[PDB]
Design a protein around this ligand. Sequence first.
Ligand SMILES: Nc1nc2c(ncn2[C@@H]2O[C@H](COP(=O)(O)OP(=O)(O)OP(=O)(O)O)[C@@H](O)[C@H]2O)c(=O)[nH]1
Ligand SMILES: Nc1nc2c(ncn2[C@@H]2O[C@H](COP(=O)(O)OP(=O)(O)O)[C@@H](O)[C@H]2O)c(=O)[nH]1
Ligand SMILES: [Mg+2]
Lengths: 416, 40, 218, 434
Amino acid sequence: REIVHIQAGQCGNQIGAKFWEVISDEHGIDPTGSYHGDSDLQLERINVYYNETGNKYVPRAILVDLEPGTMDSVRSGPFGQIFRPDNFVFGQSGGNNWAKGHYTEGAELVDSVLDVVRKESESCDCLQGFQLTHSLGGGTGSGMGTLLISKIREEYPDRIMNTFSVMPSPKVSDTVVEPYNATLSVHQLVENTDETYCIDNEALYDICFRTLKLTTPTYGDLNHLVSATMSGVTTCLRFPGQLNADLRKLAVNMVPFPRLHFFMPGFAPLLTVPELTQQMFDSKNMMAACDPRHGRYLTVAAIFRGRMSMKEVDEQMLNVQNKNSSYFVEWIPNNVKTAVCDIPPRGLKMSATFIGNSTAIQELFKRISEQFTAMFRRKAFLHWYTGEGMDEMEFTEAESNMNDLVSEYQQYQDAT
Amino acid sequence: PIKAAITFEDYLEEQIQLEEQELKQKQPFLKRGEGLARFT
Amino acid sequence: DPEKVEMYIKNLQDDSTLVRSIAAAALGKIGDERAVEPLIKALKDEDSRVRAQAAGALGQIGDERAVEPLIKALKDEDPSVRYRAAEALGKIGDERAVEPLIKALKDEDTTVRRIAATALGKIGDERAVEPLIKALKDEDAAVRLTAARALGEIGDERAVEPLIKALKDEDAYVRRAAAQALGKIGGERVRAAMEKLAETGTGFARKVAVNYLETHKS
Amino acid sequence: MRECISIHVGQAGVQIGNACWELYCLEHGIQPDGQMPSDKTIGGGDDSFNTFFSETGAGKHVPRAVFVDLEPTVIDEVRTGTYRQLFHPEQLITGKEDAANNYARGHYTIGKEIIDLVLDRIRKLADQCTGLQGFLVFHSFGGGTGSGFTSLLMERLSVDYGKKSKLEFSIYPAPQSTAVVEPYNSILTTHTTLEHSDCAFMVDNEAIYDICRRNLDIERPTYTNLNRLISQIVSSITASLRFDGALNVDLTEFQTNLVPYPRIHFPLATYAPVISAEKHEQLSVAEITNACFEPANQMVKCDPRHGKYMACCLLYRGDVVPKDVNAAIATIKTKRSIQFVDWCPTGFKVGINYQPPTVVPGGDLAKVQRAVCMLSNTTAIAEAWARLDHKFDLMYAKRAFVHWYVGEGMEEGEFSEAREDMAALEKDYEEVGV
Ligand SMILES: Nc1nc2c(ncn2[C@@H]2O[C@H](COP(=O)(O)OP(=O)(O)OP(=O)(O)O)[C@@H](O)[C@H]2O)c(=O)[nH]1
Ligand SMILES: Nc1nc2c(ncn2[C@@H]2O[C@H](COP(=O)(O)OP(=O)(O)O)[C@@H](O)[C@H]2O)c(=O)[nH]1
Ligand SMILES: [Mg+2]
């Protein structure tokens, strides 16, 4: 039943607040927590993300940042009134140093976060697991976010751990140490999460600039894509059906190998059933900067939203697999699952969201590894990482784990 | 507002020296396969 | 085929329970008397599906050597085995099975009670008349059906009055079997009883009595 | 008499159970509050339909049934529905964390936490029986609960209920929908249950789906449509057990004459007629009997023309006379070529249950005055197993998803043990087709 949401750092809290704004409108929850919708479909699975005292629905959301300024901006927002004030865990000094987030300032704050996590988990008949939004290029979302994952994992080893991780890009952010932070975090995510949606800033920037023809993209423009994707991927969890209805059934059907749990999210439109089906598998619609045609799909989930024929969706889905059989792993029969929800997202009448476990995701990891290795070979800025406690061997272990991850994807890409 | 760094690792060489320009003025970790242990 | 019989006889000692039960079934279809002693040994098999096939095969061959082992198979834990043994005992028709089959009419399982009743009628022993008269009052219609039929098949007059009561049964097939059984018994005991029913009796019972006196004249 | 406990496991089992007991109630004249005005005895009734319903002192007729699920959602609908008062609240048993499509969670880690309560409730149910004949177990092959918890339950039942017959109505998976790992759960559950089951009736969801589209003109069949059709078939099978009649064939006689051979205990069911309510003349005994041999009416996608029969049973219901069945059977023998094995006894076993088929009001089926269900033990069923085994093989060869199971209290060697057992079962079917 219940999912506990946690958002950590600058990126994590900005995209997290956008997620709550988007799903709050879909569920008829106003900024005061009152329900003002006109459908029982909305409140069928409302308890998955919202707590009840009765005349009020409150997001089961925990907001964390070492920099206090972030909690201020979220509180000033439209829905910066729905979040329970006691669930905001703010420090005083943030600085894109993974070691400070994972071992220093972040470690000093983590137990207070766990106290709130513990308090939320006490009021849940059937806790499904955890959903974390964060970026991997920073110091808090990355270093503290993965510390929170590790600590939560060893306190709740029987609960599914899910993340929406924002992969950094030099085309969006000027911070030189982001490859280090991303690599250190990817090592944690490989061992401690069940499913990670890779939201690539490289792909988001390319989409806004090249596809959406926005010559001046802001983080708000990138986050519009993120929120539309996050709403779509959680549709299965928020409404009735059968397909990937909870975090465990989803992970059991999406993850063939424990370490291969990094998903490539897609969205259409950026508007017929054949169009939504075709545009969903188009490289230009991927939220990870990887060409799916340059790899194979191990498992895929597609969520269609709107008024359309479930008969024609079945026809089109059978057809897309038939035409592109070469791009799907032949040794995982019926590896594409479809879900069709009647409620479309705000502003669209028909939409579809793709969630693929594709070996093409190795292209994103290769990009981070190439940057990390270029930095690490010259031992650039290592001093201020080891100066915060961290060991040099963690860099080596993280690099080797990520290269092992790449080779596994390549192994199954070429397999019978 | 997006502040882009990139042109490729040439930005890295330019920043290793820019870091040394500021100087001129003046714990147990996760192991590989540790998560796999959860499948025994 | 003699080499085929010898092959199935050896298969009765195979490690597989499927191989053993198929061989017992095949030996019953073949019907060679060479298989009688090996099939009697298969009646003491650890698996019930094998014991039941062996019991059925023994009825098909019909050797009297199997009468005592099949009588022991009537007191078996599995109802499929007791059904298959009761059926085989009636088929062989040895009247050593009359007393064991009489006790089998009081069996917890309906298939056994039906099969024991028809087996008693096949044997046609007069000893089974009092126990089959009590089977006419059975909770199940199929058991009453086979008991009525068996009483007619045996033909002892003690069953006349209870068969006339069965003409007023709730089940239509039971009433017709009882009427056929009364006709099969025949004689002055049935004729005098039909004379009473033709004037006093009502419904199907009256109809049967009037039809009996129409076809039984001078 | 001979009582029968029905056990409904997982979502498919419970939802099918709802369709069955809704139909049983209609067929027998039992109201949703359990009252049967019809029943003469208030402490009992007519003690023939008492095989499936116990009777309270108040005159309440309660199903001898247990509903079990690892998640509460499905059974909570039974607890708050039209039949919230038909069943006892302790006959509805639910965990909080479902098996998440994982056999190992259903059989080991999660299933353990409920098994003892289920067996205690079965031991209580058994106490109210004069002579328990056995169990009727409804479950999906694909689900974690339907596969794992059913196998666990079947193993535990065998300790002190071994001498009792166990029959299972199993939902064979079809992707049109499927969890990717359903072939794993399917092979795993078939292997573990095989030695503790007397007969298993498979119902291929794709076959039922296609009958709904073609025969009932339902463009998008729901599980409700599917379950209503399945329950009509279940009813025809169990009718001999719930209705007094001279021509009705008892469980012992039917199970012995359809599955006399131990491992090969999977018969193909065919039901006729399936007619839409939207339409209608009267189908004769010969016409419905002819329809039994058309592949469109089969419950499992298969061709009995490609295999050999080991046994065949015909379960008629309604306005059916024995002489008309004999004439219809004689006719089909002169047209159709029903090939039996060279060692099996040839011939058809026929059971005629007098009460005709009842339709659920609103249901897409027309009311017919006569219907039949054919159960044939054919070697053609190996085709259905081959399909499941092949999908299992593709994934297992790469060890895809295996970690989910090995992390939930199960050993990897159990996959190969289960698969080798299925390969032996396939070989058994080839051996009888001699
Ligand atoms: N005929 C029929 N099939 C069903 C029904 N519900 C589910 N199925 C099928 O059963 C399979 C899914 O397994 P489920 O029975 O739902 O799972 P479960 O037994 O509850 O186990 P968990 O989901 O792991 O808790 C799929 O192949 C479905 O198509 C139903 O009511 N009727
Ligand atoms: N998509 C997205 N990326 C952002 C946003 N804000 C920052 N980022 C990314 O987040 C990273 C910066 O680290 P961050 O977690 O934000 O700062 P911290 O509070 O010191 O951890 C870089 O990868 C940025 O590109 C945002 O609102 N949206
Ligand atoms: Mg379920």
